[PDB]
Symmetry: D3
Subunit: 201 residues, 6 copies
């Protein structure tokens, strides 16, 4: 997991000209102010009018620099009815979350050794779920109303590997011959899938 | 922080006769069932009719054995008007939280090297705070209504060191001459404070 | 990464009745024998007559119990001409590898913050590649001959999340409405893809 | 615990104008000299004429920059007769110590899960004690003569949270209404306690 | 470094029949007693009438089971005049030490990247030294009186690799042709050196 | 082990004027290029005409800057007939390797607690070995032809402590009186050994 802190506070210096290190260099304490341990960025619902039908409002170290070195971060996800936060992976964190409003099918997938078992249930207000580091998982709004959840991670920068978008719309895309062999379907089907992710989102 | 996991899942075997190790031994996967990644324990408010005027509903590994090895846990805290979750420390985790309802003064205290500086603000619905591992902190309900928050930790078992309860109601209590020297007051004041925590809570 | 060792040696006790812990309990040293630090399991090529056109011969802790607690493991992958080791993720390890024979296209994909960039090149005998923990990656045999590679991980049990198999052949499968929303195609296309992975491999 | 080192030596560059990171940037080896692995700062007794009746002579990374990245530090504590090193916490390290001269009552307090149990004994010359990371603990000189101890930590910068001083004399102090609720006594008692710590030490 | 603890206390169960794990299984708290955080084993000087002319009194987890999971241990080393604690390595810990009596030459050796540089000085009462994890180091009594030091490690079980004993008195010994090639001397010189360590100490 | 990464990529900035930190500062991604995850430095055999009769071709972070933060590295070792990679230690990594050509005696030595036990066998093409962090080990070419192996480490910078060279040819060398006491032979023998390593290699 994230390296442990070596002092009380180390607010990320996010200036583009700052020297680059594992994580982020820190602001001198004299420039950190009094409010760095606090945020209000998650008070408002994200706009769910996206191809997925969900919106992620991130509160990683880039959005909450006071989390730098502390080994944690958060985000909020809002869902239109029938919207999905599609199969995805966090390369560097386990996730722990609570549904705040609505009804969300939450699915978590074991690795090959676990027989690729799918664990899932419809999670409602006040109910929680946990997703081990690096495993594929998703959420899907099964209700008629807008739903949302708030989640936390044991990393300042968990990362997100969106499976459909990286499989079909990476920069540049994976060669079609690789995907026809891997997906066991003809080039026409692979190209149809590529066509849906051509815009980079 | 918590040791990283060495497999996908390892549900804590909480049987009193189980061999003891750092953390917990695990249930065989055949006996884990399908629901271990999920909990509903935080759906209901805790009873705030306590001396503190708050109630902690824990979702550590003891209450959510599916978190075993995963490096995370949660809890919920409810507050009566004027209620406090008193100055306390988590010995083994950073805390990251969101106020869900009401108005909570949240205070976070730096160590000696940070000049014992107090960082505080009134945190309202949807707003968040972060508490570095091992630092003293508190919450206080400054509103007229009941308030609650939901918090996460980067440990399955963060621990709680309540400052007033530990100082005055440890088992056995700290000798009075130690406390008179440390607190710079007469024995009468120390014995008064001890009398308020004589039940171990 | 994997927890550090707390003694010189701790050979995994792989008996089905052994108590379960994070990782594995260990054989008493009296029963470990003299050969546990050594293996010959990767001397022979795997059978590439598979749908993928590749074969993985694993040398994780299950196959090499002497690696228990040591923070490392290996495997070998053999490829038929035109064969793929399909897009996949290791949830708990960085991978570092060398191509031993043939010509392999090796592709490594950044996360969302890296713009889902695809880094790739054709890697030949004696040439090497490195794959950060949790990132999607693949290999494809672009040569006319059989190819093979030998790779190492900074975990005793890196895990493997095969993207096509997990998306379409999980147990149970991900519901079709989740996949139609995520993949931006009709149910017919999703059910076609499911049919190709219906045997769980 | 502290992040592991990534090279042999990395002497802290403690210049006030140096870029800030988790821990400290390092001096080039050409500027480190030949003596960085050694210190003589603990050869002399600290002056015990302080309100606590003890003096801490620190040998953390700020005083011994050669410890940077190495995951260890030390200090010496001297005690007047009847003097205390008051209830305190190290947020980022376990402590391991030896009494060198005199008779010191050493007390270590479990967390809530341990029933806030107090473990204690009078520790004499050559005898040792260990204090788990983040737990409240104290020392008290029960002898008629000056006493001292030398302790080590598994961090370059363990930190110190002095319980009485941060509870009553933080910058700014915790609001009195918070403390009356938490300590279960009247405002007059809280103000008396505050008055003893008003100077910041 | 050592895995972090997942609870307050976990006293090593050192029974020969206990299940084996990374580190040690733990005594139930009901059986731990009240004294596990304390030791008196280092109060007395070791017998320096040895070939080395020094004696190590160990306080690792085997001798102080209360250190289990806590990431620390200690030992004491006593020296006859002209005695050595010979060139050695700790495979799993940084060492931090203080000379308590006498005059000890302490030498610390950089790795190949550090040009195998030897850092050394004569360390006297109250003076300290630090040895990075895995590096070769030694002590030698240059005084006319008996000397002793007390050292701490950031591991419960640092391990000791004695260079002369391992090179010449391993069980079984390293083959003579390996040592003649490595040491650049004839078989006669190697067999002479082997003869000095033929008892395994 | 090496601190975990806090982002996808962080290519080492190896400019001599760069600020120094634990590990290495990183190049901005705009300057990293497209090829940093790949190397061809191990395609060619090293020249085995050295006193040891072996050559190490390193692929640590200094030679493969793309490994920075990723917790892995590699090297290749080539052996003349009768050549040795002499008893040595990696202070910061376990090693996992495969013999590619020839016949190599591979020896691994336990610490004092393991009775300084020597584990060894002749390892041939495709066969593997594992060496726990910090333990002394060697390889010796028992065949009539040139042999080679390729190994990986769970560190970007494992380090190398060559036992004969640091014992006898450090900068400056260990004083002869220390070595006569430690090795249990006369000064003449110690000086003969020193004479073989006087050139610093
Ligand atoms: C999202 O924002 C767009 C652009 O402002 C707007 O047209 C749309 O109605 C919004 N959707 C929702 C669900 O609020
Ligand atoms: C809350 O606790 C108080 C005091 O113990 C008790 O009188 C009351 O019955 C409790 N309320 C509920 C709803 O159980
Ligand atoms: C390889 O696998 C195929 C398909 O299962 C099988 O027909 C063939 O016998 C296998 N080859 C060997 C050498 O076992
Ligand atoms: C400590 O120092 C002060 C100021 O120099 C001095 O007056 C006092 O006597 C000293 N106390 C002791 C115990 O040495
Ligand atoms: C110290 O060891 C020597 C050699 O084994 C022995 O003769 C002597 O009795 C020992 N001294 C004590 C005090 O036990
Ligand atoms: C190694 O290189 C040297 C110098 O170029 C050469 O003389 C020697 O023959 C080479 N040895 C081998 C075994 O290639
Ligand atoms: Mn997620
Ligand atoms: Mn808290
Ligand atoms: Mn892979
Ligand atoms: Mn302390
Ligand atoms: Mn040592
Ligand atoms: Mn090696």
């Amino acid at each position: 997991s994230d390296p442990d802190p070596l002092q009380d506070f180390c607010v990320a210096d996010l200036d583009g000209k700052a020297v680059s290190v594992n994580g982020h260099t820190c602001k001198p304490m004299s420039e950190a102010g009094d409010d760095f341990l606090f945020s209000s960025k998650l008070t408002k619902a994200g706009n769910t009018s996206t191809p997925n039908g969900s919106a992620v409002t991130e509160l990683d170290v880039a959005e909450w620099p006071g989390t730098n070195t502390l080994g944690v971060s958060m985000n909020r996800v809002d869902f239109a009815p029938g919207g999905t936060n599609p199969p995805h992976i966090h390369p560097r964190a386990t996730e722990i979350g609570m549904v705040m409003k609505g009804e969300l099918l939450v699915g978590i997938l074991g690795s090959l050794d676990s027989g690729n078992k799918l664990y899932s249930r419809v999670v409602r207000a006040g109910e929680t779920f946990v997703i081990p580091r690096g495993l594929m998982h998703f959420q899907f709004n099964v209700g008629k109303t807008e739903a949302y959840m708030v989640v936390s991670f044991n990393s300042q920068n968990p990362g997100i590997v969106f499976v459909p978008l990286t499989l079909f719309g990476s920069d540049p895309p994976i060669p079609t011959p690789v995907l026809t062999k891997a997906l066991r379907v003809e080039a026409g089907v692979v190209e149809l899938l590529k066509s849906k992710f051509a815009g980079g989102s």
